[PDB]
Design a protein around this ligand. Structure first.
Ligand SMILES: *[C@@H]1O[C@H](CO)[C@@H](O[C@@H]2O[C@H](CO)[C@@H](O[C@@H]3O[C@H](CO[C@@H]4O[C@H](CO[C@@H]5O[C@H](CO)[C@@H](O)[C@H](O)[C@@H]5O)[C@@H](O)[C@H](O)[C@@H]4O)[C@@H](O)[C@H](O[C@@H]4O[C@H](CO)[C@@H](O)[C@H](O)[C@@H]4O)[C@@H]3O)[C@H](O)[C@H]2NC(C)=O)[C@H](O)[C@H]1NC(C)=O
Ligand code: NAG
Ligand code: MAN
Ligand code: CA
Ligand code: CA
Ligand code: CA
Ligand code: CA
Ligand code: CA
Ligand code: CL
Ligand code: CL
Ligand code: CU
Ligand code: CU
Ligand code: CU
Ligand code: CU
Length: 498
Protein backbone atom coordinates (compact mmCIF):
# COMPACT_ATOMS: atom_id res chain seq x y z
CA UNK A 1 0.00 0.00 0.00
CA UNK A 2 1.03 3.59 -0.48
CA UNK A 3 -0.13 6.86 1.09
CA UNK A 4 -1.13 9.17 2.55
CA UNK A 5 1.84 10.92 0.91
CA UNK A 6 2.88 9.25 -2.34
CA UNK A 7 3.80 9.56 -6.00
CA UNK A 8 1.41 7.70 -8.29
CA UNK A 9 3.16 7.22 -11.61
CA UNK A 10 0.89 6.46 -14.53
CA UNK A 11 2.31 4.60 -17.53
CA UNK A 12 1.22 2.34 -20.35
CA UNK A 13 2.16 -1.36 -20.19
CA UNK A 14 1.18 -4.65 -21.69
CA UNK A 15 -0.51 -6.87 -19.08
CA UNK A 16 -2.28 -10.24 -18.95
CA UNK A 17 -4.56 -10.33 -15.91
CA UNK A 18 -6.76 -13.07 -17.45
CA UNK A 19 -3.97 -14.77 -19.45
CA UNK A 20 -4.58 -12.63 -22.56
CA UNK A 21 -2.07 -9.83 -23.25
CA UNK A 22 -3.23 -6.30 -24.00
CA UNK A 23 -1.99 -2.74 -23.75
CA UNK A 24 -3.32 -0.94 -20.69
CA UNK A 25 -2.83 1.86 -18.25
CA UNK A 26 -1.04 0.99 -15.01
CA UNK A 27 -0.15 2.95 -11.86
CA UNK A 28 3.15 2.20 -10.12
CA UNK A 29 3.46 -0.60 -12.68
CA UNK A 30 0.37 -2.50 -11.57
CA UNK A 31 -3.26 -3.23 -12.41
CA UNK A 32 -5.46 -2.68 -10.47
CA UNK A 33 -3.81 0.46 -9.27
CA UNK A 34 -2.10 0.03 -5.87
CA UNK A 35 -4.05 0.23 -2.69
CA UNK A 36 -3.89 3.68 -1.15
CA UNK A 37 -4.34 3.90 2.62
CA UNK A 38 -4.43 6.37 5.48
CA UNK A 39 -6.41 7.05 8.64
CA UNK A 40 -9.49 9.14 9.36
CA UNK A 41 -8.71 12.85 9.04
CA UNK A 42 -5.37 12.38 7.27
CA UNK A 43 -3.96 14.78 4.70
CA UNK A 44 -3.49 12.97 1.46
CA UNK A 45 -0.76 14.37 -0.78
CA UNK A 46 -1.03 12.24 -3.87
CA UNK A 47 1.25 13.42 -6.61
CA UNK A 48 0.04 12.17 -9.96
CA UNK A 49 3.04 11.76 -12.28
CA UNK A 50 1.73 11.23 -15.80
CA UNK A 51 4.03 9.35 -18.15
CA UNK A 52 1.49 7.90 -20.60
CA UNK A 53 2.34 7.59 -24.32
CA UNK A 54 -0.66 5.83 -25.82
CA UNK A 55 -2.93 8.33 -27.59
CA UNK A 56 -5.71 5.74 -28.13
CA UNK A 57 -6.11 5.27 -24.34
CA UNK A 58 -5.62 9.06 -23.88
CA UNK A 59 -2.32 10.58 -22.86
CA UNK A 60 -3.83 13.08 -20.43
CA UNK A 61 -5.61 12.12 -17.22
CA UNK A 62 -7.50 13.30 -14.16
CA UNK A 63 -8.05 11.30 -10.99
CA UNK A 64 -11.14 11.10 -8.81
CA UNK A 65 -10.98 9.85 -5.20
CA UNK A 66 -14.33 8.17 -5.05
CA UNK A 67 -16.49 8.91 -2.03
CA UNK A 68 -14.40 11.66 -0.41
CA UNK A 69 -16.33 14.84 0.25
CA UNK A 70 -13.46 17.20 -0.73
CA UNK A 71 -14.95 19.96 1.43
CA UNK A 72 -12.93 23.07 0.61
CA UNK A 73 -10.90 21.17 -2.00
CA UNK A 74 -13.40 20.89 -4.83
CA UNK A 75 -10.55 21.50 -7.29
CA UNK A 76 -9.07 18.10 -6.26
CA UNK A 77 -12.20 16.06 -6.92
CA UNK A 78 -11.08 14.87 -10.38
CA UNK A 79 -13.91 14.91 -12.97
CA UNK A 80 -12.33 16.27 -16.16
CA UNK A 81 -14.02 19.49 -17.27
CA UNK A 82 -16.01 19.69 -14.03
CA UNK A 83 -13.31 20.22 -11.45
CA UNK A 84 -10.08 20.50 -13.47
CA UNK A 85 -8.56 20.24 -16.90
CA UNK A 86 -6.62 17.03 -17.56
CA UNK A 87 -2.95 16.63 -16.61
CA UNK A 88 -0.57 16.46 -19.54
CA UNK A 89 1.79 13.57 -20.12
CA UNK A 90 5.25 14.61 -18.90
CA UNK A 91 3.70 16.68 -16.12
CA UNK A 92 2.72 16.04 -12.52
CA UNK A 93 -0.14 17.38 -10.41
CA UNK A 94 -0.51 17.25 -6.64
CA UNK A 95 -3.86 16.28 -5.21
CA UNK A 96 -3.69 17.69 -1.70
CA UNK A 97 -6.77 17.09 0.42
CA UNK A 98 -8.00 15.88 3.83
CA UNK A 99 -10.57 13.32 4.85
CA UNK A 100 -12.09 14.65 8.06
CA UNK A 101 -14.99 12.64 9.37
CA UNK A 102 -14.55 9.73 6.94
CA UNK A 103 -13.25 6.22 7.35
CA UNK A 104 -14.31 3.25 5.28
CA UNK A 105 -13.76 1.59 1.93
CA UNK A 106 -13.25 3.75 -1.17
CA UNK A 107 -11.47 3.68 -4.51
CA UNK A 108 -9.89 5.90 -7.10
CA UNK A 109 -10.00 6.06 -10.84
CA UNK A 110 -9.44 8.16 -13.88
CA UNK A 111 -12.36 10.53 -14.38
CA UNK A 112 -11.58 11.42 -18.00
CA UNK A 113 -13.88 9.81 -20.63
CA UNK A 114 -13.81 5.98 -20.36
CA UNK A 115 -10.12 5.90 -19.43
CA UNK A 116 -10.56 4.07 -16.13
CA UNK A 117 -11.75 1.06 -18.04
CA UNK A 118 -8.35 0.80 -19.71
CA UNK A 119 -6.79 0.27 -16.28
CA UNK A 120 -6.53 3.41 -14.15
CA UNK A 121 -8.57 2.18 -11.16
CA UNK A 122 -7.77 0.73 -7.74
CA UNK A 123 -8.86 0.58 -4.11
CA UNK A 124 -8.46 3.19 -1.37
CA UNK A 125 -9.03 2.40 2.34
CA UNK A 126 -9.23 4.89 5.19
CA UNK A 127 -8.91 3.12 8.56
CA UNK A 128 -10.42 4.27 11.86
CA UNK A 129 -8.07 3.61 14.82
CA UNK A 130 -11.20 3.64 17.01
CA UNK A 131 -13.41 1.73 14.58
CA UNK A 132 -16.67 0.89 16.39
CA UNK A 133 -16.79 -2.43 14.54
CA UNK A 134 -13.19 -3.45 15.49
CA UNK A 135 -14.43 -6.06 17.99
CA UNK A 136 -16.11 -8.02 15.19
CA UNK A 137 -12.89 -9.13 13.50
CA UNK A 138 -9.25 -10.00 13.90
CA UNK A 139 -7.67 -9.15 10.54
CA UNK A 140 -8.19 -6.01 8.38
CA UNK A 141 -5.32 -5.14 6.08
CA UNK A 142 -4.16 -5.13 2.47
CA UNK A 143 -4.80 -8.88 2.24
CA UNK A 144 -8.48 -8.39 3.07
CA UNK A 145 -9.26 -5.96 0.28
CA UNK A 146 -11.15 -7.70 -2.54
CA UNK A 147 -11.50 -5.79 -5.80
CA UNK A 148 -13.93 -6.73 -8.60
CA UNK A 149 -13.11 -5.46 -12.10
CA UNK A 150 -14.63 -6.03 -15.52
CA UNK A 151 -11.91 -6.56 -18.10
CA UNK A 152 -12.14 -6.12 -21.89
CA UNK A 153 -9.85 -7.56 -24.53
CA UNK A 154 -10.48 -4.54 -26.78
CA UNK A 155 -9.72 -1.02 -25.49
CA UNK A 156 -12.48 1.38 -24.53
CA UNK A 157 -12.06 3.65 -27.57
CA UNK A 158 -11.71 0.69 -29.96
CA UNK A 159 -14.64 -1.55 -29.01
CA UNK A 160 -18.38 -0.93 -29.17
CA UNK A 161 -19.73 2.30 -27.73
CA UNK A 162 -21.83 0.11 -25.39
CA UNK A 163 -20.07 -3.23 -24.88
CA UNK A 164 -22.11 -6.40 -24.77
CA UNK A 165 -20.31 -7.52 -21.60
CA UNK A 166 -16.77 -7.90 -20.37
CA UNK A 167 -14.40 -10.63 -21.47
CA UNK A 168 -13.50 -11.55 -17.91
CA UNK A 169 -14.21 -10.75 -14.31
CA UNK A 170 -11.01 -10.06 -12.32
CA UNK A 171 -10.93 -10.58 -8.56
CA UNK A 172 -7.86 -8.95 -7.07
CA UNK A 173 -6.64 -8.46 -10.65
CA UNK A 174 -6.90 -12.11 -11.79
CA UNK A 175 -9.58 -14.21 -13.51
CA UNK A 176 -10.44 -16.30 -16.54
CA UNK A 177 -12.08 -15.62 -19.85
CA UNK A 178 -13.81 -18.32 -21.90
CA UNK A 179 -10.70 -18.34 -24.07
CA UNK A 180 -8.33 -18.61 -21.05
CA UNK A 181 -9.90 -21.36 -18.91
CA UNK A 182 -6.59 -22.17 -17.22
CA UNK A 183 -5.45 -18.68 -16.30
CA UNK A 184 -4.25 -18.08 -12.76
CA UNK A 185 -7.00 -17.35 -10.24
CA UNK A 186 -6.66 -15.03 -7.28
CA UNK A 187 -6.17 -16.65 -3.90
CA UNK A 188 -7.44 -15.03 -0.75
CA UNK A 189 -5.85 -16.65 2.32
CA UNK A 190 -7.48 -17.21 5.68
CA UNK A 191 -6.53 -19.04 8.87
CA UNK A 192 -9.14 -21.26 10.54
CA UNK A 193 -10.53 -19.60 13.65
CA UNK A 194 -9.88 -16.01 12.57
CA UNK A 195 -12.44 -13.37 11.60
CA UNK A 196 -11.71 -11.06 8.65
CA UNK A 197 -13.01 -7.65 7.63
CA UNK A 198 -13.16 -8.12 3.86
CA UNK A 199 -13.45 -4.86 1.99
CA UNK A 200 -15.23 -5.54 -1.26
CA UNK A 201 -14.66 -2.84 -3.88
CA UNK A 202 -16.37 -2.64 -7.26
CA UNK A 203 -13.95 -1.12 -9.80
CA UNK A 204 -16.52 -1.88 -12.48
CA UNK A 205 -16.95 0.08 -15.70
CA UNK A 206 -20.40 -1.42 -16.17
CA UNK A 207 -21.69 -4.77 -14.77
CA UNK A 208 -22.96 -5.34 -11.30
CA UNK A 209 -21.80 -8.52 -9.54
CA UNK A 210 -23.60 -11.05 -7.35
CA UNK A 211 -20.93 -11.97 -4.87
CA UNK A 212 -20.78 -14.96 -2.54
CA UNK A 213 -18.29 -17.34 -0.92
CA UNK A 214 -19.18 -21.03 -0.75
CA UNK A 215 -20.03 -22.30 2.72
CA UNK A 216 -19.39 -18.92 4.38
CA UNK A 217 -21.88 -16.34 5.54
CA UNK A 218 -21.10 -12.64 5.11
CA UNK A 219 -21.88 -10.13 7.84
CA UNK A 220 -22.15 -6.73 6.15
CA UNK A 221 -20.92 -3.89 8.36
CA UNK A 222 -20.25 -1.01 5.92
CA UNK A 223 -21.68 0.31 2.64
CA UNK A 224 -19.93 2.97 0.49
CA UNK A 225 -17.77 4.30 3.34
CA UNK A 226 -20.55 4.39 5.96
CA UNK A 227 -20.68 1.89 8.82
CA UNK A 228 -23.94 -0.04 9.05
CA UNK A 229 -25.73 -2.15 11.62
CA UNK A 230 -24.53 -5.77 11.00
CA UNK A 231 -26.67 -7.87 8.60
CA UNK A 232 -25.77 -11.49 7.83
CA UNK A 233 -26.39 -12.72 4.31
CA UNK A 234 -25.20 -15.31 1.78
CA UNK A 235 -24.78 -13.03 -1.22
CA UNK A 236 -24.36 -9.35 -2.03
CA UNK A 237 -25.26 -7.68 -5.35
CA UNK A 238 -22.70 -4.89 -5.78
CA UNK A 239 -23.26 -2.24 -8.44
CA UNK A 240 -20.56 -0.34 -10.26
CA UNK A 241 -18.50 1.78 -7.88
CA UNK A 242 -20.16 0.54 -4.66
CA UNK A 243 -18.20 -0.84 -1.69
CA UNK A 244 -19.12 -3.12 1.19
CA UNK A 245 -17.24 -4.45 4.20
CA UNK A 246 -18.32 -7.82 5.43
CA UNK A 247 -17.01 -10.00 8.24
CA UNK A 248 -16.13 -13.58 7.33
CA UNK A 249 -15.56 -16.06 10.14
CA UNK A 250 -13.13 -18.72 8.88
CA UNK A 251 -14.93 -21.41 10.80
CA UNK A 252 -15.35 -24.07 8.13
CA UNK A 253 -13.03 -27.00 7.47
CA UNK A 254 -9.52 -26.32 6.25
CA UNK A 255 -10.21 -26.46 2.50
CA UNK A 256 -10.58 -24.47 -0.73
CA UNK A 257 -13.85 -22.63 -1.33
CA UNK A 258 -15.02 -20.77 -4.43
CA UNK A 259 -15.42 -16.99 -4.25
CA UNK A 260 -18.03 -16.16 -6.87
CA UNK A 261 -18.72 -12.83 -8.59
CA UNK A 262 -21.42 -13.30 -11.22
CA UNK A 263 -21.94 -10.32 -13.54
CA UNK A 264 -25.43 -9.31 -14.69
CA UNK A 265 -24.48 -9.85 -18.34
CA UNK A 266 -21.54 -10.95 -20.44
CA UNK A 267 -20.15 -14.41 -19.60
CA UNK A 268 -22.36 -15.51 -16.69
CA UNK A 269 -22.02 -18.54 -14.41
CA UNK A 270 -18.85 -20.38 -13.43
CA UNK A 271 -17.86 -22.87 -16.18
CA UNK A 272 -14.11 -23.56 -16.00
CA UNK A 273 -13.82 -21.18 -13.07
CA UNK A 274 -14.70 -17.94 -14.84
CA UNK A 275 -16.16 -15.27 -12.50
CA UNK A 276 -14.32 -16.95 -9.63
CA UNK A 277 -11.47 -16.78 -7.16
CA UNK A 278 -10.28 -19.10 -4.37
CA UNK A 279 -10.68 -18.75 -0.63
CA UNK A 280 -7.82 -20.97 0.60
CA UNK A 281 -7.43 -21.91 4.22
CA UNK A 282 -3.91 -22.16 5.59
CA UNK A 283 -2.83 -25.80 5.43
CA UNK A 284 -5.11 -26.66 2.49
CA UNK A 285 -3.55 -28.06 -0.68
CA UNK A 286 -3.00 -25.55 -3.49
CA UNK A 287 -5.82 -26.87 -5.66
CA UNK A 288 -9.07 -25.46 -7.07
CA UNK A 289 -12.18 -25.64 -4.93
CA UNK A 290 -14.86 -28.21 -5.74
CA UNK A 291 -17.45 -26.63 -3.43
CA UNK A 292 -21.04 -25.70 -4.31
CA UNK A 293 -23.01 -22.54 -3.61
CA UNK A 294 -25.56 -23.18 -0.88
CA UNK A 295 -26.57 -19.57 -0.05
CA UNK A 296 -30.17 -18.46 -0.18
CA UNK A 297 -30.20 -14.94 1.23
CA UNK A 298 -29.36 -11.92 -0.96
CA UNK A 299 -28.73 -8.61 0.83
CA UNK A 300 -31.51 -6.07 0.41
CA UNK A 301 -30.52 -2.39 0.44
CA UNK A 302 -33.56 -1.78 2.63
CA UNK A 303 -31.88 -3.83 5.35
CA UNK A 304 -28.88 -1.55 5.43
CA UNK A 305 -29.10 1.08 8.20
CA UNK A 306 -26.39 3.35 9.57
CA UNK A 307 -24.56 2.26 12.70
CA UNK A 308 -24.99 5.76 14.14
CA UNK A 309 -28.29 7.66 13.89
CA UNK A 310 -28.32 9.75 10.64
CA UNK A 311 -31.65 11.58 10.39
CA UNK A 312 -33.14 12.18 6.96
CA UNK A 313 -33.13 15.86 5.82
CA UNK A 314 -36.52 17.39 5.05
CA UNK A 315 -40.14 16.45 5.78
CA UNK A 316 -41.32 12.82 5.72
CA UNK A 317 -43.39 13.09 2.54
CA UNK A 318 -42.78 12.84 -1.21
CA UNK A 319 -41.47 16.20 -2.30
CA UNK A 320 -40.85 17.14 1.35
CA UNK A 321 -37.40 18.68 0.92
CA UNK A 322 -36.57 22.36 0.50
CA UNK A 323 -35.69 21.69 -3.17
CA UNK A 324 -37.11 18.69 -5.00
CA UNK A 325 -35.56 17.68 -8.34
CA UNK A 326 -36.54 14.89 -10.69
CA UNK A 327 -34.09 13.42 -13.17
CA UNK A 328 -36.03 12.30 -16.26
CA UNK A 329 -33.92 9.91 -18.35
CA UNK A 330 -33.88 9.53 -22.11
CA UNK A 331 -31.72 8.22 -24.93
CA UNK A 332 -31.51 8.73 -28.71
CA UNK A 333 -29.56 5.56 -29.66
CA UNK A 334 -26.21 7.32 -29.17
CA UNK A 335 -26.55 9.90 -26.35
CA UNK A 336 -28.23 9.79 -22.94
CA UNK A 337 -30.28 12.72 -21.66
CA UNK A 338 -31.36 13.95 -18.25
CA UNK A 339 -34.26 16.40 -18.38
CA UNK A 340 -33.72 16.71 -22.13
CA UNK A 341 -30.01 17.57 -21.99
CA UNK A 342 -26.96 15.41 -22.68
CA UNK A 343 -23.68 15.98 -20.88
CA UNK A 344 -20.84 16.84 -23.21
CA UNK A 345 -17.65 18.07 -21.47
CA UNK A 346 -17.37 21.86 -21.68
CA UNK A 347 -14.15 23.49 -22.84
CA UNK A 348 -13.86 25.35 -19.59
CA UNK A 349 -14.22 23.22 -16.46
CA UNK A 350 -17.33 24.11 -14.49
CA UNK A 351 -15.26 25.14 -11.46
CA UNK A 352 -13.18 27.51 -13.64
CA UNK A 353 -16.38 28.91 -15.20
CA UNK A 354 -17.56 29.82 -11.71
CA UNK A 355 -14.18 31.29 -10.74
CA UNK A 356 -14.40 33.50 -13.83
CA UNK A 357 -17.79 34.80 -12.73
CA UNK A 358 -20.65 32.59 -13.92
CA UNK A 359 -23.20 32.74 -11.13
CA UNK A 360 -26.39 31.13 -12.28
CA UNK A 361 -27.08 27.61 -13.47
CA UNK A 362 -28.00 29.18 -16.84
CA UNK A 363 -24.63 30.84 -17.37
CA UNK A 364 -22.86 27.50 -16.88
CA UNK A 365 -21.99 25.08 -19.70
CA UNK A 366 -23.01 22.59 -20.95
CA UNK A 367 -26.42 24.12 -21.57
CA UNK A 368 -29.19 22.90 -19.32
CA UNK A 369 -27.04 20.32 -17.46
CA UNK A 370 -26.21 22.37 -14.38
CA UNK A 371 -28.48 22.78 -11.34
CA UNK A 372 -28.03 25.48 -8.68
CA UNK A 373 -28.58 24.18 -5.14
CA UNK A 374 -29.17 26.57 -2.25
CA UNK A 375 -27.00 26.10 0.82
CA UNK A 376 -28.21 24.72 4.14
CA UNK A 377 -31.17 23.07 2.52
CA UNK A 378 -32.58 19.62 2.21
CA UNK A 379 -32.59 18.27 -1.33
CA UNK A 380 -34.68 15.41 -2.69
CA UNK A 381 -33.76 13.86 -6.04
CA UNK A 382 -35.75 11.17 -7.80
CA UNK A 383 -34.46 8.97 -10.64
CA UNK A 384 -37.51 7.18 -11.97
CA UNK A 385 -36.64 4.09 -14.01
CA UNK A 386 -37.85 4.28 -17.58
CA UNK A 387 -37.69 2.22 -20.76
CA UNK A 388 -36.57 5.48 -22.43
CA UNK A 389 -33.05 4.88 -20.99
CA UNK A 390 -31.76 1.41 -21.94
CA UNK A 391 -29.07 -0.25 -19.81
CA UNK A 392 -31.01 -0.42 -16.51
CA UNK A 393 -30.26 -0.79 -13.70
CA UNK A 394 -28.28 2.49 -13.82
CA UNK A 395 -26.20 3.04 -10.67
CA UNK A 396 -26.14 6.76 -9.98
CA UNK A 397 -23.37 8.49 -8.07
CA UNK A 398 -23.29 11.90 -6.38
CA UNK A 399 -19.94 13.54 -5.76
CA UNK A 400 -19.19 15.57 -2.62
CA UNK A 401 -21.81 13.79 -0.51
CA UNK A 402 -23.38 10.75 0.94
CA UNK A 403 -27.15 10.63 0.60
CA UNK A 404 -30.02 8.82 2.28
CA UNK A 405 -31.70 6.27 0.06
CA UNK A 406 -35.27 6.94 1.12
CA UNK A 407 -36.63 4.62 -1.54
CA UNK A 408 -34.53 1.76 -2.96
CA UNK A 409 -34.86 -0.20 -6.19
CA UNK A 410 -37.19 -3.19 -5.83
CA UNK A 411 -39.09 -1.52 -2.99
CA UNK A 412 -42.18 0.69 -2.97
CA UNK A 413 -41.61 2.01 0.52
CA UNK A 414 -40.22 5.34 1.72
CA UNK A 415 -38.06 5.28 4.80
CA UNK A 416 -37.60 8.63 6.50
CA UNK A 417 -36.35 7.13 9.81
CA UNK A 418 -33.24 5.06 9.19
CA UNK A 419 -32.46 4.52 5.50
CA UNK A 420 -28.95 3.65 4.42
CA UNK A 421 -26.60 6.52 3.59
CA UNK A 422 -24.29 5.78 0.68
CA UNK A 423 -22.87 7.37 -2.50
CA UNK A 424 -23.83 5.05 -5.38
CA UNK A 425 -27.37 3.68 -5.74
CA UNK A 426 -29.03 1.39 -8.24
CA UNK A 427 -31.97 3.18 -9.89
CA UNK A 428 -33.65 -0.15 -10.64
CA UNK A 429 -35.88 -0.98 -13.59
CA UNK A 430 -39.08 0.30 -15.25
CA UNK A 431 -40.55 -3.24 -15.01
CA UNK A 432 -40.51 -2.89 -11.21
CA UNK A 433 -41.95 0.65 -11.42
CA UNK A 434 -38.91 1.91 -9.50
CA UNK A 435 -38.58 5.50 -8.37
CA UNK A 436 -35.36 5.60 -6.40
CA UNK A 437 -35.36 8.65 -4.16
CA UNK A 438 -32.47 10.22 -2.24
CA UNK A 439 -32.08 13.05 0.29
CA UNK A 440 -29.08 15.08 1.36
CA UNK A 441 -28.27 18.42 2.95
CA UNK A 442 -26.22 21.12 1.22
CA UNK A 443 -23.26 21.87 3.42
CA UNK A 444 -20.46 21.65 0.83
CA UNK A 445 -20.05 24.51 -1.68
CA UNK A 446 -18.80 23.47 -5.11
CA UNK A 447 -19.83 21.94 -8.43
CA UNK A 448 -20.34 18.22 -7.85
CA UNK A 449 -20.98 15.69 -10.61
CA UNK A 450 -24.12 13.49 -10.52
CA UNK A 451 -24.08 10.68 -13.07
CA UNK A 452 -24.58 7.07 -13.96
CA UNK A 453 -21.41 5.15 -12.97
CA UNK A 454 -21.63 2.83 -15.98
CA UNK A 455 -18.66 4.61 -17.58
CA UNK A 456 -19.93 4.00 -21.12
CA UNK A 457 -23.16 5.81 -20.21
CA UNK A 458 -21.38 8.69 -18.51
CA UNK A 459 -19.25 9.15 -21.65
CA UNK A 460 -22.47 9.15 -23.70
CA UNK A 461 -23.79 12.04 -21.64
CA UNK A 462 -25.69 10.48 -18.72
CA UNK A 463 -24.79 13.20 -16.21
CA UNK A 464 -25.66 16.53 -14.65
CA UNK A 465 -23.80 18.90 -12.31
CA UNK A 466 -25.04 20.01 -8.88
CA UNK A 467 -23.67 23.56 -8.52
CA UNK A 468 -23.95 23.75 -4.74
CA UNK A 469 -24.02 27.23 -3.11
CA UNK A 470 -22.71 29.05 -6.16
CA UNK A 471 -22.12 32.33 -4.17
CA UNK A 472 -19.50 30.64 -2.00
CA UNK A 473 -17.90 28.16 -4.40
CA UNK A 474 -14.91 30.48 -4.83
CA UNK A 475 -14.74 31.48 -1.15
CA UNK A 476 -14.77 27.86 0.00
CA UNK A 477 -12.34 26.32 -2.49
CA UNK A 478 -9.18 28.35 -2.87
CA UNK A 479 -7.15 26.83 -5.69
CA UNK A 480 -3.41 26.18 -5.88
CA UNK A 481 -1.23 27.64 -8.59
CA UNK A 482 -0.68 24.22 -10.16
CA UNK A 483 -4.45 23.88 -10.58
CA UNK A 484 -4.70 27.35 -12.22
CA UNK A 485 -1.96 26.24 -14.63
CA UNK A 486 -3.70 23.06 -15.75
CA UNK A 487 -6.10 24.52 -18.28
CA UNK A 488 -3.65 26.80 -20.10
CA UNK A 489 -1.26 23.84 -20.40
CA UNK A 490 -3.98 21.49 -21.53
CA UNK A 491 -5.45 23.90 -24.06
CA UNK A 492 -2.00 24.44 -25.62
CA UNK A 493 -1.57 20.68 -26.37
CA UNK A 494 -1.85 19.21 -29.85
CA UNK A 495 -5.09 17.20 -30.07
CA UNK A 496 -2.98 14.05 -30.55
CA UNK A 497 -1.50 14.67 -27.08
CA UNK A 498 -4.86 14.72 -25.35
C1 LIG B 1 -2.14 1.78 -27.60
O1 LIG B 1 -3.30 1.15 -27.02
C2 LIG B 1 -4.19 0.43 -27.89
C3 LIG B 1 -5.46 -0.02 -27.17
O2 LIG B 1 -5.08 -0.80 -26.03
C4 LIG B 1 -3.48 -0.77 -28.57
O3 LIG B 1 -4.37 -1.28 -29.52
C5 LIG B 1 -4.11 -2.64 -29.85
O4 LIG B 1 -3.82 -2.57 -31.26
C6 LIG B 1 -3.60 -3.90 -31.79
C7 LIG B 1 -3.10 -3.74 -33.21
O5 LIG B 1 -4.03 -2.98 -33.98
C8 LIG B 1 -4.89 -4.70 -31.74
O6 LIG B 1 -4.60 -6.01 -32.30
C9 LIG B 1 -5.63 -6.83 -32.57
O7 LIG B 1 -5.24 -7.92 -31.72
C10 LIG B 1 -6.21 -8.95 -31.73
C11 LIG B 1 -5.81 -10.04 -30.73
O8 LIG B 1 -4.44 -10.37 -30.94
C12 LIG B 1 -4.23 -11.76 -31.10
O9 LIG B 1 -4.97 -12.76 -30.43
C13 LIG B 1 -5.27 -13.56 -31.56
C14 LIG B 1 -6.24 -14.68 -31.25
O10 LIG B 1 -7.45 -14.37 -31.92
C15 LIG B 1 -8.32 -13.81 -30.93
O11 LIG B 1 -8.54 -14.59 -29.78
C16 LIG B 1 -8.67 -13.63 -28.74
C17 LIG B 1 -8.63 -14.30 -27.38
O12 LIG B 1 -7.41 -15.02 -27.37
C18 LIG B 1 -9.90 -12.73 -28.96
O13 LIG B 1 -9.66 -11.60 -28.16
C19 LIG B 1 -10.08 -12.25 -30.40
O14 LIG B 1 -11.40 -11.80 -30.63
C20 LIG B 1 -9.67 -13.31 -31.43
O15 LIG B 1 -10.63 -14.35 -31.46
C21 LIG B 1 -4.01 -14.05 -32.30
O16 LIG B 1 -4.46 -14.36 -33.58
C22 LIG B 1 -2.94 -12.96 -32.47
O17 LIG B 1 -1.67 -13.46 -32.83
C23 LIG B 1 -2.77 -12.15 -31.21
O18 LIG B 1 -2.28 -12.95 -30.15
C24 LIG B 1 -6.32 -9.51 -33.15
O19 LIG B 1 -7.33 -10.50 -33.24
C25 LIG B 1 -6.62 -8.43 -34.17
O20 LIG B 1 -6.42 -9.17 -35.35
C26 LIG B 1 -7.16 -8.70 -36.46
O21 LIG B 1 -8.43 -8.10 -36.34
C27 LIG B 1 -8.29 -7.02 -37.25
C28 LIG B 1 -9.52 -6.10 -37.22
O22 LIG B 1 -9.82 -5.76 -35.88
C29 LIG B 1 -7.95 -7.52 -38.66
O23 LIG B 1 -7.37 -6.42 -39.32
C30 LIG B 1 -6.91 -8.66 -38.72
O24 LIG B 1 -6.87 -9.31 -39.96
C31 LIG B 1 -7.14 -9.68 -37.62
O25 LIG B 1 -8.38 -10.35 -37.81
C32 LIG B 1 -5.63 -7.29 -34.03
O26 LIG B 1 -4.31 -7.75 -34.35
C33 LIG B 1 -5.32 -4.80 -30.26
O27 LIG B 1 -6.59 -5.45 -30.17
C34 LIG B 1 -5.38 -3.42 -29.59
N1 LIG B 1 -5.52 -3.52 -28.14
C35 LIG B 1 -6.68 -3.24 -27.49
C36 LIG B 1 -6.64 -3.55 -26.02
O28 LIG B 1 -7.71 -2.87 -28.07
C37 LIG B 1 -2.18 -0.21 -29.18
O29 LIG B 1 -1.38 -1.36 -29.63
C38 LIG B 1 -1.33 0.61 -28.21
N2 LIG B 1 -0.17 1.17 -28.90
C39 LIG B 1 1.09 0.75 -28.65
C40 LIG B 1 2.13 1.44 -29.50
O30 LIG B 1 1.38 -0.10 -27.83
C1 NAG C 1 -24.93 27.01 6.71
O1 NAG C 1 -25.20 27.97 7.71
C2 NAG C 1 -24.10 28.19 8.58
C3 NAG C 1 -24.57 29.17 9.65
O2 NAG C 1 -25.34 30.21 9.07
C4 NAG C 1 -22.91 28.77 7.83
O3 NAG C 1 -21.78 28.76 8.67
C5 NAG C 1 -22.53 27.90 6.64
O4 NAG C 1 -21.46 28.50 5.88
C6 NAG C 1 -23.79 27.54 5.82
N1 NAG C 1 -23.41 26.50 4.88
C7 NAG C 1 -23.20 26.80 3.58
C8 NAG C 1 -22.80 25.57 2.78
O5 NAG C 1 -23.34 27.96 3.11
O1 MAN D 1 0.11 -9.37 -30.79
C1 MAN D 1 1.05 -10.38 -31.06
C2 MAN D 1 0.96 -10.72 -32.55
O2 MAN D 1 -0.36 -11.14 -32.87
C3 MAN D 1 -0.54 -11.47 -34.23
C4 MAN D 1 0.28 -12.70 -34.61
O3 MAN D 1 0.83 -12.44 -35.87
C5 MAN D 1 1.42 -13.00 -33.63
O4 MAN D 1 2.46 -13.61 -34.36
C6 MAN D 1 2.00 -11.76 -32.96
O5 MAN D 1 2.77 -12.16 -31.84
CA1 CA E 1 -12.53 4.73 -31.80
CA1 CA F 1 -14.51 -31.68 4.88
CA1 CA G 1 -15.97 -31.25 8.54
CA1 CA H 1 -27.43 21.04 -23.58
CA1 CA I 1 -22.61 29.87 1.96
CL1 CL J 1 -11.45 13.25 11.45
CL1 CL K 1 -22.47 18.64 2.96
CU1 CU L 1 -16.23 6.61 -8.93
CU1 CU M 1 -17.26 10.00 -6.84
CU1 CU N 1 -26.25 3.87 -16.96
CU1 CU O 1 -18.01 10.70 -11.04
Amino acid sequence: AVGPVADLTVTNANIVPDGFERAAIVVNNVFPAPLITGNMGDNFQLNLVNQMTNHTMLKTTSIHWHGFFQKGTNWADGPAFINQCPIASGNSFLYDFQVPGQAGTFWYHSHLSTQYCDGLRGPFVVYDPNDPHANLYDVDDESTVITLADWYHVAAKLGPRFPKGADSTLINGLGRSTSTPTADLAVISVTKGKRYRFRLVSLSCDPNYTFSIDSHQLTVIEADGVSTQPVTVDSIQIFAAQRYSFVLNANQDVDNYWIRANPNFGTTGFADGVNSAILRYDDADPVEPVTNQTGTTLLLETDLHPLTSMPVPGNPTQGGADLNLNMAFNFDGTNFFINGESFTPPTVPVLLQIISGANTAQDLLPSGSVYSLPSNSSIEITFPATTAAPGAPHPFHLHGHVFAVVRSAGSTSYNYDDPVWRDVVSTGTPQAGDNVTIRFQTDNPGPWFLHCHIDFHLDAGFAVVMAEDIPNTVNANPVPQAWSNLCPTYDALEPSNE
